[PDB]
């Protein structure tokens, strides 16, 4: 955890926190997720956020639920800085095949079955390791951009 | 001679990187124009060579070799007279006035001779020519004696 | 020591000494350390602090402690400057080859062994010389940020 994670994830806290106290209640959940636009958020999911913590929200039980869930976490410019590393020459985003068989063979992380489903929702190109970049974004910040 | 001056070993000891109180062969041509000498590299190579000294190989030092190098170097400061640098320039342009064309010098000092890199040449032509592309060489080498 | 560095430190120094009577004792760096949120902080630790004094650790036994331990210690500003200086023509990162030839080639604290530490936790952009200034604020306030 580098310490501008740490404060994007301070920040987080106090924007779920609408109360201020400190402590991320079941009532912050459901009046963050309803400032958002969520008008029929059911309160069984909100107690199955508060069912992954042991006690209270605070923002240290904040940050070790996410440590644990994000054990492999990594930011923007070290996968990029990876992925520089596999195309050396710069710009060019780097063929399918060519990452499907260095994943296989080196690691046992990079199997098959675990690359089918990098392809899929990973696109074509992220998946098929021509383009890159965008797969650094979505792994930082999920979902479509 | 003492005028002993103890200076030169203090200087010593700011270019010897290991703190030992030698300095490397390679060295000593750099150093003795730090201690205010000019000998040109080819004198600084032949004297070397002359006392079967290769700076070929790893080579050390000590201060009682390096003091006598600079004082066999210091009879040869008679041959830094300033009106034959002057007029040497003068003799390079064209017209009353002392202007080198910037590319002139600058691929003069580079391959006549002993090789200057043109890192260096950049480095002594930045502040006295401007963009005109013309060196006042009156300037250019009262700067170049300042140090 | 400029002074804002002076009364920086006059600041943390004020939020150790809880007890507000001008020395730090142990129990002060216990309670700032349990209100960091460091609740298993262990008496040897607090005990190692305390052995670097040959006194009682007021106003300015902490500083010339930490004037003994910083005595190459350089504000962001005086580094940013070097580095403009490095950099002459402004904006860009300088190369990484051309800060590991310069510390070397002028100096014996820019030795390389120290320049594969350099880049060693001070990252690649860091490291290599390229980006600038994270490096300045990581010599001010250490840890990733």
């Known amino acids: 955890f580098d310490e501008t994670e740490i404060e994007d994830f301070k920040e987080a806290f106090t924007v779920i926190d609408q109360n ?10 459901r009046e963050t997720f309803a400032a958002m636009g969520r008008l029929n958020v059911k309160n069984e999911e909100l107690d199955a956020m508060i ?8 923002f240290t039980v ?4 996410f440590g ?11 996968i990029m800085g990876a992925f520089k590393v596999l195309d050396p020459d710069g710009k060019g985003s780097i063929k399918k095949s060519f990452l499907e068989e260095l994943l296989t063979t080196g690691g046992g992380r990079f199997t098959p079955e675990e690359i089918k489903n990098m392809w899929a929702a990973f696109p074509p190109d992220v998946a098929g390791n021509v383009d890159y970049k965008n797969i650094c974004y979505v792994i930082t910040h999920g979902e479509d951009a | 001679s003492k005028a002993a001056a103890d200076d030169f070993k203090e200087a010593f000891l700011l270019f010897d990187r290991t703190g030992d109180a030698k300095i490397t062969a390679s060295q000593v041509g750099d150093i003795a124009r730090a201690l205010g000498q000019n000998p040109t590299n080819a004198e600084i190579n032949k004297i070397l060579g002359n006392p079967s000294k290769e700076e070929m190989n790893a080579a050390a030092i000590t201060f009682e070799e390096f003091l006598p190098m600079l004082q066999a170097a210091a009879n040869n400061k008679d041959q830094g007279t300033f009106e ?3 007029e040497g320039l003068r003799v390079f342009d064209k017209e009353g006035n002392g202007t080198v064309m910037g590319a002139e010098l600058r691929h003069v000092l580079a391959t006549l001779g002993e090789k200057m890199t043109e890192e260096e040449v950049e480095e002594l032509m930045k502040g006295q020519e401007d963009s005109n592309g013309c060196i006042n060489y009156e300037a250019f080498v009262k700067h170049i004696m300042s140090v």
């Open chain 1, 20 to 29: 201020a106290d400190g402590i991320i209640d079941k009532d912050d959940l």
């Open chain 1, 68 to 78: 644990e869930k994000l054990k492999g976490a990594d930011p923007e410019d070290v």
């Open chain 2, 84 to 86: 034959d640098f002057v």
């Open chain 1, 62 to 65: 904040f940050l070790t639920m």
């Open chain 1, 51 to 58: 069912k992954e913590a042991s006690g209270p929200i605070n």
